[PDB]
From a paper:
[name]-3 (or [name]-3) is a mini-focus (beam size 18 µm × 14 µm) highly intense (2.0 × 1013 photons s−1), fixed-energy (12.81 keV) beamline for macromolecular crystallography (MX) experiments at the European Synchrotron Radiation Facility ([name]).
In a second experiment, bovine trypsin purchased as lyophilized powder from Sigma (reference: T9201) was crystallized as follows: A solution of 40 mg ml−1 trypsin, 10 mg ml−1 benzamidine (Sigma B-6506) and 3 mM CaCl2 was mixed in a 1:1 ratio with reservoir solution [2 M (NH4)2SO4 in 100 mM Tris-HCl pH 8.5] at room temperature. Diffraction data were then collected at 100 K using two different strategies: the first based on a strategy provided by EDNA/BEST, the second using a manually determined strategy optimized for data collection speed. As can be seen in Table 2, the two data sets are of comparable quality (automatic processing using EDNAproc) with both giving clear structure solutions, requiring only little additional refinement (adding waters, benzamidine and other buffer molecules, adjusting side chains, etc.), using the [name] automatic molecular replacement pipeline.
Author numbering: 19 to 241
């Protein structure tokens, strides 16, 4: 997260880190046994880390649980990042409490101008690289589909939305991928892509979660 703030330990209780010996992506806990992330985050051998603040120090609220299975969206296109969504099942249910908690799926698609909370352990620099050890947070509005398409001609599908600031300075970044965009207490986006981070006229592009609620619910019900 570029141009964000330190969230505070366990203030984003649905935020998970995906670990394969190291943090590589974020995710969102949507019930005691399932995580939503970005399909471009797929790999084998995932350990889900819940209850994290400092991802390099054991602070006392962690739960580390290996994934039993991953399900990439059946229409994921890695070239276009259309349908950049995957589900990860935990081998055992997490223990839920105020510091480790699921986030609800949306009932409604959020609109342009709605304020959302974007969070992650990704790069905090637009130029060069600095990884934080603690969770970073950013409040950002959803942008109009017209401003989104104008920023990224030929690239924005009906399964994407832009959020952030056309002026630059404030954005998600590398290492935030798969993490949450939460608006009015519901998971509306997944950190997906952007051209660099926090560059002018290159806002963040997010998977549009409201399009996937039927697929998520049906997939969980049978797996
Ligand atoms: Ca920790």
């Amino acid at each position: 997260i570029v141009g964000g703030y330190t969230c505070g330990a366990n203030t984003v209780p649905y935020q998970v880190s995906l670990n394969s010996g190291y943090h590589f992506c974020g995710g969102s806990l949507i019930n005691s046994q399932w995580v939503v992330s970005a399909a471009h985050c797929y790999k084998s051998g995932i350990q889900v880390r819940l209850g994290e603040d400092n991802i390099n120090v054991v602070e006392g609220n962690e739960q580390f649980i290996s994934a039993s299975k991953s399900i990439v969206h059946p229409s994921y296109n890695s070239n276009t990042l259309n349908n950049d969504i995957m589900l990860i099942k935990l081998k055992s249910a997490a223990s839920l409490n105020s510091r480790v908690a699921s986030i609800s799926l949306p009932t409604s698609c959020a609109s342009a101008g709605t304020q959302c909370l974007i969070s992650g352990w990704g790069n905090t620099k637009s130029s060069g690289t600095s990884y934080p050890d603690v969770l970073k947070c950013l409040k950002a509005p959803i942008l109009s589909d017209s401003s989104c398409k104008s920023a990224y001609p030929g690239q924005i599908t009906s399964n994407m939305f832009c959020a952030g600031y056309l002026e630059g300075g404030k954005d998600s970044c590398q290492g935030d991928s798969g993490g949450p965009v939460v608006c009015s207490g519901k998971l509306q986006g997944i950190v997906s892509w952007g051209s660099g981070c926090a560059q002018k006229n290159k806002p963040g592009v997010y998977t549009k979660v409201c399009n996937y609620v039927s697929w998520i619910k049906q997939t969980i019900a049978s797996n």
